[model samples]
Target chain A: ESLLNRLYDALGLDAPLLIIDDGIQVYFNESDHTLEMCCPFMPLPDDILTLQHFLRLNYTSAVTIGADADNTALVALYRLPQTSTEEEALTGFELFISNVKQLKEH
Target chain B: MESLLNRLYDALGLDEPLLIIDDGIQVYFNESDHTLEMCCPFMPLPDDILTLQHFLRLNYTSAVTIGADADNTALVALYRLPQTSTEEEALTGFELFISNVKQLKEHYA
Candidate 1:
């Protein structure tokens, strides 16, 4: 297997699902089943703080950064492991969220 | 002006046309009036050669690569300053070209 394939196997990223909004891209790993959402572009401060607050509530290891790739942008990368089984019921708790509906409508 | 505004004014990054396709993106500079087209993924050898030939046929400078972003993909980017008359005829030669033909057909037929 290639290095990427090996890494995928090690990380178990097979059958990964992706959701991309206007500026944010989300990657879902189905193995351990974690949602890794990343916003590449810079956003306003309030949006970043709001996202940080929202992520902190549900995820155990919620690592939030104000910059990445040395780009010095107001962006954050969130790696969240699934903690709740009632994904549908927790919809209201998750804000700044996105999916195909937002994509189609926007 | 802010630093970005000053930079934009100095570099003249405003008021230009951009055309992006599935595999290629073209930027036309209107101030000094130049064209910069860059393709992210590398393409087949024949396609690269054909693209080079097409660009050379017009007033152009050509650059080709086999890899980018450490990812092995077939792609090519073309940057050219179309010549006075070649610009018009070259319209017929764009790869997988599309015009307002659909709108024209809808209008007429």
Candidate 2:
């Protein structure tokens, strides 16, 4: 499995992730369990970028990432879980960087 | 002049713009024409509010506003110009206007 997929599995997340890259704008739609896209210009995929941004915030505060009724399009505030190992986290980071490089090359 | 643009840059977590203070309101430049322009579609929703929400809630992900479309449906766009730079020549970027339909209609009403 890819490092990202492993991270997702490790987190025990319920929803499937979606990335849309159409050379227009990159959209990450996890609620629907599909990734849609064309070309990539940004350094990171939208979902990973959002995740990185959340991780960079103040540790004590909780913030909502996305929300809708019925929780279908919901991505709630979360603190990084303690379950991640140092090796796993490092692997995830490497995978993320590698993905970015791959996208830029296309 | 410097402070407002600096604050905006910091808040948006992106590059600072060549802005003009017209009366009391700050206006961003279009870089090409150097003319006034608005990036996001919503006029009622202020830029700072959007910036803070993106920073705190969506983790700076692009936000979609439901019911703002021509059909009164959902709409999405990038919050601001993605690239940031002190030099004007390096600031080339494009804004994505409303596109795609999100399944969540709860936020629309």
Candidate 3:
């Protein structure tokens, strides 16, 4: 199975939110706080593409990319409140990322 | 079968620092990426009390909380790098909390 499919199965996600723009297919699950995307014959590394997805979803939460040590597959996990108001979510995401960056530098 | 403590010992061994944040929350630091990550695999809304623990640990250093789960267990893990200036102090309380959560997860896993 594809890495994305394996992740979906492990996490038990339901119907995902699909976004198609700029010739890229983005699959997101607001309820599960998960995301997956791909392109036909894509050239970018999975990790780099996963980072882009996180950047797009940053307004809602902090994201991380996980994969096997052998780099066979990749998955994205977002940490955010599902029922939070837009304002609260945005503020929380901002604070969360800020601290994360600071800690990364330490 | 491996016991929770055994699993934890396997996950983390040796004389690492430890801290008890509260009854249900803990955090610790490792020589990994210097990032503070949070995961609450049991509730949509995280226990605000965890935030208080973060505040106490970091003082004004700025810490981030990420909610990772909403399962009934309320599992959450917070990760961060120790600041060089106050690395010792931070490790004192910080290391324990992180290990506790990792053990908690293993215990229930």
In the order shown, the candidates' Cα RMSDs to the true structure are: 21.7, 16.2, 17.7
Worst 10 residues of 1 chain B by lDDT: B58-67
lDDT, candidate 3, A1-106, per-residue tens: 3334444444454444333343323333333332222112122243433323322222223343332223333333333334444454445444533443432342
TM-score for each model: 0.21, 0.24, 0.28
Better of 1 and 3 by DockQ: 3
What docking grade does candidate 2 earn?
incorrect
Q: Determine the C-alpha RMSD for candidate 2 after optimal superposition of all C-alphas.
A: 16.2
lDDT of 1 by residue, B1-109 (tens): 2332223234433333443343333322222223222222223323233232232221111112111111222222222222332433333323312222222223321
Q: Candidate 1, what DockQ?
A: 0.01
Ten-residue region with minimum lDDT total, candidate 2 chain A: A30-39
Q: Which ranges of candidate 1 are over 4 A from the true structure? A: A1-23, A27-34, A43-65, A69-72, A86-94, A98-106, B1-109
Q: Which candidate has the top score in lDDT?
A: 3
Off by over 4 Å in 3: A1-16, A22-24, A30-61, A67-72, A88-106, B1-26, B29-104, B107-109
DockQ scores for all the models shown? 0.01, 0.07, 0.02
**Number of clashes recorded per candidate:** 7, 9, 18
Model 2 lDDT at residue A42: 38
Candidate 1: residue pairs that collide: B39-B77, B41-B74, B41-B75, B42-B74, B42-B75, B43-B74, B43-B75
The candidates' interface RMSDs, in order, read 21.0, 13.2, 14.0
